[PDB]
Amino acid sequence: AQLEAE
Amino acid sequence: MVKNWLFGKKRKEDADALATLKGQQNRLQAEARNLERQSDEQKILASKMLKAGNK
Amino acid sequence: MVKNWLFGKKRKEDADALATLKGQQNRLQAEARNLERQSDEQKILASKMLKAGNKAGARQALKRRAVFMKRLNTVHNTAMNLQAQIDSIQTATSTAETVKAMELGTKVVGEKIKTVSPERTERVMDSVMEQRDQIEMMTEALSDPSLSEGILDFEDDAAIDEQLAQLEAE
């Protein structure tokens, strides 16, 4: 999720 | 000028033990740096898998 | 210059084991690349069967491609398992060196702790305390003001009281 948000 | 024979002997022994510990610590720091590099490469790969359309 | 005969022997053995594992892993990577190539050729063939008007042949080619990709997955997982074994060998080597360094340090610190034991430090600090008390008592015995005072007022400071009063009035 955090990499996608990145 | 008194020679402290036992003192110098134990000094050499403690210096060798400290050298051994410092060498193993330096090896572990190098291994840590390599593991950090590998983690960064894996994050770059994860970003490319996200962009390419492969979750 | 001490020779570590057993250490060098086991080093050669571990190097040969790592070479064997790396060679088999390289073989598996080459096989994986070839299987990927074959899968791509099968997909191209499936596309041509679709264009030519042969759906049965397209299904045939896609089934063959599915078999090739399953083989590719198995080969890749086997190569990953070999990498895990290589990492286990290197981790065991590093852990052995760490335990040896810790045992050396423990030996040195144990010799020091046995030499200067805690009971020895207790004895030294007790002696320091006792001697400090004796110096204080000796050096306060010599400083008793009763000598330089010597004769004290029988009137108990009355004359000196009035002298201070008279000097204040002055």
Side-chain angles (χ1 to χ4, degrees), chain A residues 1 5, chain B residues 2-46 52-53, chain C residues 2-46 52-53 56-58 61-150 158-159 165 169:
Chain B
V2 77
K3 279 91 209 188
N4 306 103
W5 298 92
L6 188 71
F7 180 86
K9 199 213 185 199
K10 300 300 198 199
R11 208 192 49 225
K12 269 130 76 215
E13 298 183 10
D14 305 12
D16 287 346
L18 287 162
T20 288
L21 284 151
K22 271 305 307 172
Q24 182 56 20
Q25 205 193 8
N26 272 29
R27 267 197 294 284
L28 285 173
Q29 295 304 341
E31 164 173 13
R33 177 191 336 289
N34 170 36
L35 277 164
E36 231 170 45
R37 172 261 265 149
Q38 286 200 329
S39 284
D40 281 30
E41 310 267 277
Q42 284 296 310
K43 203 170 188 178
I44 289 323
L45 152 73
Chain C
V2 77
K3 279 91 209 188
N4 306 103
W5 298 92
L6 188 71
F7 180 86
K9 199 213 185 199
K10 300 300 198 199
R11 208 192 49 225
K12 269 130 76 215
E13 298 183 10
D14 305 12
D16 287 346
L18 287 162
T20 288
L21 284 151
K22 271 305 307 172
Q24 182 56 20
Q25 205 193 8
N26 272 29
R27 267 197 294 284
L28 285 173
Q29 295 304 341
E31 164 173 13
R33 177 191 336 289
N34 170 36
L35 277 164
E36 231 170 45
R37 172 261 265 149
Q38 286 200 329
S39 284
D40 281 30
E41 310 267 277
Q42 284 295 310
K43 203 169 188 178
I44 289 323
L45 152 73
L62 286 188
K63 264 184 75 169
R64 206 182 343 279
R65 182 176 159 282
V67 175
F68 284 142
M69 307 288 320
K70 200 192 102 87
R71 301 238 290 259
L72 186 284
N73 189 65
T74 286
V75 156
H76 176 240
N77 292 11
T78 320
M80 293 334 302
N81 284 30
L82 291 184
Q83 188 62 63
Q85 187 130 11
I86 288 165
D87 288 349
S88 172
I89 286 160
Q90 278 151 14
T91 298
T93 286
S94 64
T95 298
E97 295 301 83
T98 288
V99 167
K100 261 171 272 179
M102 289 207 193
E103 283 194 333
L104 194 60
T106 59
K107 186 187 139 292
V108 157
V109 169
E111 293 177 350
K112 279 144 152 49
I113 285 160
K114 92 159 307 303
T115 288
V116 175
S117 41
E119 166 222 290
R120 172 160 168 193
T121 323
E122 295 302 320
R123 260 178 304 108
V124 173
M125 270 318 258
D126 286 5
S127 293
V128 171
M129 241 76 87
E130 183 178 2
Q131 290 179 0
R132 193 264 305 274
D133 281 8
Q134 279 168 312
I135 301 330
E136 162 153 52
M137 152 183 102
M138 260 154 35
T139 202
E140 95 192 343
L142 290 170
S143 78
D144 201 345
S146 78
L147 286 39
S148 64
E149 288 181 353

